[PDB]
Paper text:
Secretagogin is built by three domains (denoted here as A, B and C), each comprising a pair of EF-hand motifs. Here, we identify secretagogin as a molecular switch between syntaxin-4, a protein facilitating the movement of reserve vesicles toward the active zone, and SNAP-25, a core member of the vesicle fusion complex.
We presented the 82-GLQNLREEIKQLGREVRAQLKAIEPQKE-109 syntaxin-4-derived peptide as a C-terminal tag on GFP for secretagogin binding. Diffracting crystals were obtained with the structure of the protein complex determined at 2.65 Å resolution (for statistics and model parameters see SI Appendix). The syntaxin-4-derived peptide ligand was bound at the C-domain of secretagogin in the same groove as the SNAP-25-derived peptide. The electron density map allowed the modeling of a 22 AA (Q84-E105) and a 24 AA (G82-E105) segment of the 28 AA-long syntaxin-4 peptide stretch in the respective copies of the asymmetric unit. The binding was stabilized by polar contacts and hydrogen bonds at the N-terminal end, whereas the remaining segment was dominated by hydrophobic stacking between apolar sidechains (82-GLQNLREEIKQLGREVRAQLKAIEPQKE-109 polar interaction/HF-stacking). The segment, which formed hydrophobic interactions included contact residues L86, I90, L93, G94, V97, and L101 with Van der Waals distances in the range of 3.5 to 4.0 Å to the residues building the groove. One apparent difference was the presence of a disulfide bond between C253 and C269 of secretagogin in both chains of the asymmetric unit of the syntaxin-4-peptide-bound complex.
Residue numbers in the entry:
A (entry chain A): 2 to 64, 68 to 230, 234 to 255
B (entry chain C): 91 to 188, 191 to 273
Amino acid sequence: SKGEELFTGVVPILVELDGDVNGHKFSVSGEGEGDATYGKLTLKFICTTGKLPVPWPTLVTTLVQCFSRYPDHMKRHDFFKSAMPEGYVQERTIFFKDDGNYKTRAEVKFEGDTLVNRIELKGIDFKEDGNILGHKLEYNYNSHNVYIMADKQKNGIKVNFKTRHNIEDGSVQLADHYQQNTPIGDGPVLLPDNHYLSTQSALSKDPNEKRDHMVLLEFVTAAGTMQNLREEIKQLGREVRAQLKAIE
Amino acid sequence: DENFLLFFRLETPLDNSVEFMQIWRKYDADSSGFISAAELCNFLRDLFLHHKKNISEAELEEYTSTMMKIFDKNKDGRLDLNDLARILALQENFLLQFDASSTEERKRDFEKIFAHYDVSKTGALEGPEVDGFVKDMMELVQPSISGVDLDKFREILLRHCDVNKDGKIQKSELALCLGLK
Ligand SMILES: C[As](C)(=O)[O-]
Ligand SMILES: [Ca+2]
Ligand SMILES: [Ca+2]
Ligand SMILES: [Ca+2]
Ligand SMILES: [Ca+2]
């Protein structure tokens, strides 16, 4: 498929975020590239307004899920690549338990050969020394699944997942993500069966950058969909394996 | 050339895991999960006299010692499952012979598979027929099984697919717990 065709090789990526959280204005510029064949993303983000008023891990989700590896017997479910090159709108509400909430609107489209993500963010009701404005979050990310359901109503998909951000305390800050995705340029898109995205993110620093910044490595893969006899022999084996490991 | 090495000429490869498990179950006398030197010599003594070649027990000890040196990977004095699969020349996992998603092609493959492991032609998997199937099935999902685990594995497998609770796995039972018509 032509959309599926655009992610054959390595695609350069550009990301621009402009945010408003409890009055503090900031901007983030992101460069990198994505390799959908491997579900890989390497990106460097830089805050252009000096110090960032929120911790970097709270922005990983907002700062392009069209680079996910879809197992080829799940290509029918690849919605983010079926909306290309015209692109889609990604709207999110992120509720931080016992704290404020981000609401983001984003356009992800092809501008030439470059995949571009332009985001406006509004954070409100945050607490000045909650873990966000107090910069109390640890510099890492925890892997999890991202659950995807169809939304025939809006010709898009509803997505929902919870991330957990560690604190120095050994505590955990819970962020409840609610998001919808809609094609920008109209046309035929693929609305998928219920499935999830297994994503893991590593956060590093460029030793040579004095600006506030985040280096990001990301791996995303689709799963949760279903055949021949050996695969039934396999899951019988996996269930036998599971049972032996319990009694031990 | 050299004495010994006769045994490799005497060794015809094994196509089936069931027959390997019969030999394994036969010479692990203490059910320790490994093959000792004493037990290996018992296996070699019987293997030779079925071919009616004749060996004084002096060179039976000698050739047993030679085989331990060669195939005991970690020199602990014990051969494990794959140390003996090498000796008996067991070939590739039979289950690797198998895309068929149709309901009738899967029944066709299930017949070929159950025919392979039902050597006894009883219509039910029993004894080393379970072990052979368990070995080939487990090695599709994890590195490799230990000899001590197979008594655990058979117990677990029966609690999954023994619907009538008689101690053996009939054809219909294996078909049902694989999810087949
Ligand atoms: C245990 As091996 C596969 O090296 O014979
Ligand atoms: Ca033993
Ligand atoms: Ca050993
Ligand atoms: Ca039988
Ligand atoms: Ca039974």
